[PDB]
Design an enzyme around this catalytic site. Structure first.
Site, PDB file in Angstrom:
ATOM      1  N   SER A   1       0.800  -1.216   0.000  1.00 46.31           N
ATOM      2  CA  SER A   1       0.000   0.000   0.000  1.00 46.31           C
ATOM      3  C   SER A   1       0.838   1.274   0.000  1.00 46.31           C
ATOM      4  CB  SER A   1      -0.933   0.017   1.209  1.00 46.31           C
ATOM      5  OG  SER A   1      -1.439   1.323   1.423  1.00 46.31           O
TER       6      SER A   1
ATOM      7  N   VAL B   1      -1.029  -2.206  -3.887  1.00 47.20           N
ATOM      8  CA  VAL B   1      -0.323  -3.160  -4.732  1.00 47.20           C
ATOM      9  C   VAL B   1      -0.930  -4.548  -4.551  1.00 47.20           C
ATOM     10  CG1 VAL B   1       1.890  -4.267  -5.240  1.00 47.20           C
ATOM     11  CG2 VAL B   1       1.838  -1.859  -4.562  1.00 47.20           C
TER      12      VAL B   1
ATOM     13  N   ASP C   1      13.682   8.947  -5.536  1.00 50.32           N
ATOM     14  CA  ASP C   1      13.100   8.238  -4.388  1.00 50.32           C
ATOM     15  C   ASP C   1      13.866   6.958  -4.057  1.00 50.32           C
ATOM     16  OD1 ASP C   1      11.412   7.879  -2.265  1.00 50.32           O
ATOM     17  OD2 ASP C   1       9.631   7.326  -3.429  1.00 50.32           O
TER      18      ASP C   1
HETATM   19  C1  LIG Z   1       5.204  -8.240  -0.207  1.00 50.75           C
HETATM   20  C2  LIG Z   1       5.471  -7.573  -1.523  1.00 50.75           C
HETATM   21  C3  LIG Z   1       5.882  -8.348  -2.644  1.00 50.75           C
HETATM   22  C4  LIG Z   1       6.143  -7.744  -3.902  1.00 50.75           C
HETATM   23  C5  LIG Z   1       5.991  -6.346  -4.032  1.00 50.75           C
HETATM   24  N1  LIG Z   1       6.257  -5.749  -5.288  1.00 50.75           N
HETATM   25  C6  LIG Z   1       6.216  -4.407  -5.758  1.00 50.75           C
HETATM   26  C7  LIG Z   1       5.943  -3.311  -4.914  1.00 50.75           C
HETATM   27  C8  LIG Z   1       5.917  -1.986  -5.362  1.00 50.75           C
HETATM   28  N2  LIG Z   1       5.656  -0.904  -4.535  1.00 50.75           N
HETATM   29  C9  LIG Z   1       5.503  -0.898  -3.073  1.00 50.75           C
HETATM   30  C10 LIG Z   1       4.835   0.405  -2.597  1.00 50.75           C
HETATM   31  C11 LIG Z   1       4.634   0.379  -1.074  1.00 50.75           C
HETATM   32  C12 LIG Z   1       5.940   0.115  -0.296  1.00 50.75           C
HETATM   33  C13 LIG Z   1       6.712  -1.113  -0.820  1.00 50.75           C
HETATM   34  C14 LIG Z   1       6.911  -1.108  -2.362  1.00 50.75           C
HETATM   35  N3  LIG Z   1       7.926  -0.094  -2.743  1.00 50.75           N
HETATM   36  N4  LIG Z   1       6.173  -1.751  -6.687  1.00 50.75           N
HETATM   37  N5  LIG Z   1       6.453  -2.802  -7.581  1.00 50.75           N
HETATM   38  C15 LIG Z   1       6.474  -4.092  -7.115  1.00 50.75           C
HETATM   39  C16 LIG Z   1       6.791  -5.146  -8.120  1.00 50.75           C
HETATM   40  N6  LIG Z   1       6.866  -4.750  -9.423  1.00 50.75           N
HETATM   41  O1  LIG Z   1       6.990  -6.311  -7.779  1.00 50.75           O
HETATM   42  N7  LIG Z   1       5.594  -5.592  -2.955  1.00 50.75           N
HETATM   43  C17 LIG Z   1       5.340  -6.173  -1.729  1.00 50.75           C
HETATM   44  C18 LIG Z   1       4.910  -5.215  -0.639  1.00 50.75           C
END
Ligand SMILES: Cc1ccc(Nc2cc(N[C@@H]3CCCC[C@@H]3N)nnc2C(N)=O)nc1C
Length: 277
Positions: free
Chosen positions: A17, A23, A132
């Site tokens: 989130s 997400v 970021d």
């Molecule tokens: C348990 C779990 C497993 C896989 C992902 N994967 C992603 C997460 C993401 N954004 C979030 C926003 C919030 C803080 C954490 C993170 N920067 N962007 N892209 C991916 C991706 N392309 O896989 N995230 C989580 C939380």
């Protein structure tokens, strides 16, 4: 860039989130195989088209990027709300991972952060700024394969300048930001280099927060006195020296990612050599 909603299968289950939305995990029916994906889904807005074209810019940024240590955008999809669809990094954000695995080995930590410098070296060469760069925004494909994601604050630089000039803004991840960002609102690859330094410290501290218990002003206060976070427990001295080098107050004397990537690349092989003994 636009995708067919009837090829996308979302899972009722939420993964993450952020005040953009959430997400979730899902699948996109590729040409022959099904591909697992992570999807950013928007807080269905107002109608305040702020989030709406942040997502559009973010996605346009990402489609220009081709590199093994940058997360890949699959495409966008407009439905109930706006969705940014990305290849999935299953093990999730680096900081949470190390918080839940206190016994990942030092050499493994060097491997992962060097991989990030390769992605940033590439990003530097491409004249994009990330703005970021933090451990929450490094994602693990495996425990030995990191990728950079979360390009929401990212900018492609104009062909005539070496930095980007913020005009306004919402909250800034101040603890990751170089002094010239806070002072002059100028963001360049050198200031990403400063954030990478904080990212290293998070990594060798197994996902603990930087400047623990301080507010933005106390942080600014500390840094102007020339003070810097100390060496994490068990972090090699060579990697701490590189941290401090990333925190070079003066942009002109702060290294760029080519120098930083080479420094990490050499030290990782020195460590791989010693380990074989
Ligand atoms: C348990 C779990 C497993 C896989 C992902 N994967 C992603 C997460 C993401 N954004 C979030 C926003 C919030 C803080 C954490 C993170 N920067 N962007 N892209 C991916 C991706 N392309 O896989 N995230 C989580 C939380």
């Amino acid at each position: 860039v636009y995708l067919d909603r009837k090829l996308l299968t979302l899972e009722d289950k939420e993964l993450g989130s952020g005040n953009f939305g959430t997400v979730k995990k899902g699948y996109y029916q590729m040409k022959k195989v099904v591909k697992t994906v992570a999807v950013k889904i928007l807080k269905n807005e107002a109608n305040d088209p702020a989030l709406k074209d942040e997502l559009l810019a973010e996605a346009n940024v990402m489609q220009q990027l081709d590199n093994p240590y940058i997360v890949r955008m699959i495409g966008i999809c407009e439905a109930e709300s706006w969705m940014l669809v990305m290849e999935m990094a299953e093990l999730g954000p680096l900081n949470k991972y190390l918080q839940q695995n206190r016994h990942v080995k030092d050499k493994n930590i060097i491997e992962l952060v060097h991989q990030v410098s390769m992605g940033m070296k590439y990003l530097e060469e491409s004249n994009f700024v990330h703005r970021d760069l933090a451990a929450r925004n490094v994602l693990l494909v495996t425990q030995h394969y990191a990728k950079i994601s979360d390009f929401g604050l990212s900018k492609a630089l104009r062909a005539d300048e070496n930095y980007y000039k913020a005009q306004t803004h919402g909250k800034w991840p101040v603890k990751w930001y170089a002094p010239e960002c806070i002072n002059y609102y100028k963001f360049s690859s050198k200031s990403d280099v400063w954030s990478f330094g904080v990212l290293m410290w998070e990594a060798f501290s197994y996902g603990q927060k930087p400047y623990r218990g301080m507010k933005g002003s106390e942080v600014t206060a500390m840094l102007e006195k020339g003070e810097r976070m100390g060496c994490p427990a068990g972090c090699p001295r060579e990697m701490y020296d590189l941290m401090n080098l990333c925190w070079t107050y003066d942009v002109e004397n702060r290294p760029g990612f080519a120098a930083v990537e080479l420094r990490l690349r050499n030290y990782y092989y020195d460590v791989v050599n010693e380990g074989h003994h």
